[PDB]
Design an enzyme around this catalytic site. Structure first.
Site: not given
Ligand SMILES: COc1cc2c(c(OC)c1)[C@@H]1[C@H]3CCC[C@@H](C(=O)N1CC2)N3C(=O)C(=O)c1cc(OC)c(OC)c(OC)c1
Length: 127
Positions: A45, A55-56, A75, A101, A118
């Site tokens: 993704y 952001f990622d 999520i 979130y 995404f």
């Molecule tokens: C705290 O670090 C993370 C937390 C989460 C996730 C994660 O993925 C690398 C890192 C994932 C990802 C991928 C599935 C969908 C979504 C998501 O729901 N998750 C589970 C929460 N999600 C994100 O929204 C995401 O890309 C992301 C990336 C992040 O850092 C690159 C991050 O903070 C470190 C973050 O915090 C909520 C979310």
């Protein structure tokens, strides 16, 4: 751009029909089967904020993101959206904050009340 296009041209895939998760299929995947609850799903993704920030990206990590579907490990928009995908599919998902979130956000990357974009590729799914 792609976020605007899925916003304006995407299909509502929510149960509630509240426009909270919109989807466009970018590449049709294989056959008809979608994953089931509890499957180990492997995806690549990229995620963008509504301000344009990337952001990622799993691609940038050289490893897929792996989770168990339908367990709240991700999520809500992801549990709903990945459940619609076939193996090999690529889709775009537009995720309103109620399916992401929310008002909390998630520091450091995600603001309060954030609509997320995404691009997701379903690599494989396995019980
Ligand atoms: C705290 O670090 C993370 C937390 C989460 C996730 C994660 O993925 C690398 C890192 C994932 C990802 C991928 C599935 C969908 C979504 C998501 O729901 N998750 C589970 C929460 N999600 C994100 O929204 C995401 O890309 C992301 C990336 C992040 O850092 C690159 C991050 O903070 C470190 C973050 O915090 C909520 C979310």
């Amino acid at each position: 751009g792609a976020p605007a296009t899925v916003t304006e041209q995407g299909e509502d895939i929510t149960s509630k029909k509240d426009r909270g998760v919109l989807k466009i299929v970018k590449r049709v995947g294989n056959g008809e089967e979608t994953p089931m609850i509890g499957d180990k799903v492997y995806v690549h993704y990229k995620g963008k904020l509504s301000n344009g920030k990337k952001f990622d990206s799993s691609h940038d990590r050289n490893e897929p993101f792996v989770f168990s579907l339908g367990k709240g490990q991700v999520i809500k928009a992801w549990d709903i959206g990945v459940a619609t995908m076939k193996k090999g599919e690529i889709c775009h998902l537009l995720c309103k904050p109620e399916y992401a979130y929310g008002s909390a956000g998630s520091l450091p990357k995600i603001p309060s009340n954030a609509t997320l974009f995404f691009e997701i590729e379903l690599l494989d799914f396995k019980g």
